[PDB]
């Protein structure tokens, strides 16, 4: 009943930016200071994975 549109999920961009900038510094403790790390989307396989 009514209009239709896809389900979605919102995340505040500032909070996510801060969370990533805080996690990268803890990762640098294991994989080197003054280095670059990346993360793209999933590789492929199961829909639940």
């Amino acid at each position, epitope marked *: *009943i*009514g*209009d239709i*549109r896809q389900a*979605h999920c919102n995340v505040s961009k500032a909070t996510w930016n801060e969370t990533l900038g805080k996690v990268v510094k803890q990762l640098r403790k294991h994989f080197g200071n003054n280095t670059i790390i990346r993360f793209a989307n999933s590789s492929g396989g199961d829909l639940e994975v």
Partner: antibody, heavy 125, light 109 residues
């Protein structure tokens, strides 16, 4: 680009009621409000009422209390105006009006660039 | 209530002549709730200018809109025989919409 399609002309006896349909084509339904602007033969434009389809934010004209009723039908995606206690004054041409422009809010305070072809209501016994 | 009035009831203009229609509001209204419509020969009204200044889609350069607070003006620098008829101003701000009484333009003779 949106569009509005109305019904055909009708002749009703004085004192009875009349029902006019208005269906949009190619656009959002529950967002912007549907207004009704009538024109008596030879006079200026007159605002009948306004109503958001499904939300229910509606309001009629001061002249059209106890005689006007605006409703809708979403299975058909069509709004409906009902006018009771018809006199020779209510004879004229009625226009279904609407504005076009993740937004789930509802607008009622907006102009009308999309106009229906019109419906000719003739009150004559 | 909020009611509108239009001053130059019948405004005569020839080809290339410049005219200015007026639309006075009763109370003080915002400059973002006034629109101008064109109605030629009892046909469908066409939105000329929204928000008293925002020229609509495809509306030519000849139609310029101004106004603030109480008075709103519609200036036509030049005109073809295409744009003749009744011009109406609409207040679309509050919960009650109201139109202008209409203003017809003539070929000046």
């Amino acid at each position: 680009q949106v569009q509005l399609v109305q019904s055909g002309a009708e002749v009703r006896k004085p004192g009875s009621s009349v029902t006019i349909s208005c269906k949009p084509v190619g656009g959002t339904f529950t967002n912007f409000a549907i207004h009704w602007v009538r024109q008596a033969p030879g006079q200026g434009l007159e605002w009948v009422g306004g109503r958001v389809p499904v939300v229910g934010i509606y309001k009629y004209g001061k002249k059209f209390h106890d005689r006007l009723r605006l409703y809708e039908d979403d299975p058909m995606k069509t709004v409906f105006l009902e006018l009771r206690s018809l006199t020779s004054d209510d004879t004229g041409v009625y226009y279904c009006t609407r504005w076009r422009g993740y937004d789930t809010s509802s607008y009622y305070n907006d102009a009308s660039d999309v106009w229906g072809p019109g419906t000719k209501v003739i009150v004559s016994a | 209530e909020i009611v509108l009035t239009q001053s130059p009831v019948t405004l005569s203009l020839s080809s290339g002549e410049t005219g200015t229609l007026s639309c006075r509001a009763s109370q003080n209204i915002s400059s973002s709730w006034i629109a101008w419509y064109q109605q030629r020969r009892g046909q469908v009204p066409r939105l000329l200018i929204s928000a008293a200044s925002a020229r609509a889609a495809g509306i030519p350069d000849r139609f310029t809109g101004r106004g603030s607070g109480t008075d709103f003006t519609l200036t036509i620098t030049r005109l073809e025989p295409e744009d003749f008829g009744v011009y109406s101003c609409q207040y679309y701000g509050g919960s009650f919409f109201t139109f202008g009484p209409g203003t017809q333009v003539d070929v000046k003779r």
